[PDB]
From Swiss-Prot:
Responsible for the cleavages located at the N-terminus of the replicase polyprotein. Participates together with nsp4 in the assembly of virally-induced cytoplasmic double-membrane vesicles necessary for viral replication. Antagonizes innate immune induction of type I interferon by blocking the phosphorylation, dimerization and subsequent nuclear translocation of host IRF3. Also prevents host NF-kappa-B signaling. In addition, PL-PRO possesses a deubiquitinating/deISGylating activity and processes both 'Lys-48'- and 'Lys-63'-linked polyubiquitin chains from cellular substrates. It is a multi-pass membrane protein. The chain holds residues 1025 to 1191 of 7096 of the full protein. It comes from Severe acute respiratory syndrome coronavirus 2. Inhibited in vitro by GRL-0617. This is Papain-like protease nsp3.
Length: 167
């Protein structure tokens, strides 16, 4: 038994809620919050910009040091950094950005990173500002992640559509 509340069960291991991931993080303080990152860990908008603002830019400062040492992530890749005031850890995961021509098949690789963590609070990768089909992202999540994932979907209208269309 964990501290996530009001989630709808989709599968054995996938749960979903209409919520802002930042507000869920602040309330739950989960072991792992997933950031919808880009390869440069430049946190400007969506999940990344919202989480970073909630850390008072500490996430960006830490990320800039990570990139200066290690160089960019791969599309489909990830790194574990601090969760600051929001979680123990933040798993920065790079889904493909359709608005940049990246291969949607890399979305499965992106979700595979979740399997290294027993429980995660996460957003829908590659959807929203990243330009890919959200029904598809949820399907890839369900078919790829085997650990326990609590999905926070910000847009009410999209949350209703994801639930109603779920197979
Ligand atoms: C489905 C991907 C998520 C990712 N972004 C976030 N997910 C969770 N919490 C967040 N807090 C700040 N951004 C958040 N985008 C949204 O839900 C809203 C954008 C949108 C509007 C209309 C149709 C589809 C998508």
């Amino acid at each position: 038994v964990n501290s996530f509340s009001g989630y709808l069960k989709l599968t054995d291991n996938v749960y979903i809620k209409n919520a802002d991931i930042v507000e869920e993080a602040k309330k739950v303080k989960p072991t792992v919050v997933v950031n919808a990152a880009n390869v440069y860990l430049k946190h400007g908008g969506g999940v990344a910009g919202a989480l970073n603002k909630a850390t008072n830019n500490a996430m960006q400062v830490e990320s800039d040091d990570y990139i200066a040492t290690n160089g960019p992530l791969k599309v489909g890749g990830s790194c574990v950094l601090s969760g600051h005031n929001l979680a123990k850890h933040c798993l920065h995961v790079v889904g493909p950005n359709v608005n940049k021509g990246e291969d949607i098949q890399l979305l499965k690789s992106a979700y595979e990173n979740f399997n290294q963590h027993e429980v995660l609070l996460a957003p829908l990768l590659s959807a929203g500002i990243f330009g890919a089909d959200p029904i598809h992202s949820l399907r890839v999540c369900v078919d790829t992640v085997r650990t326990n994932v609590y999905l926070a979907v910000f847009d009410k209208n999209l949350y209703d559509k994801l639930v109603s269309s779920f197979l």
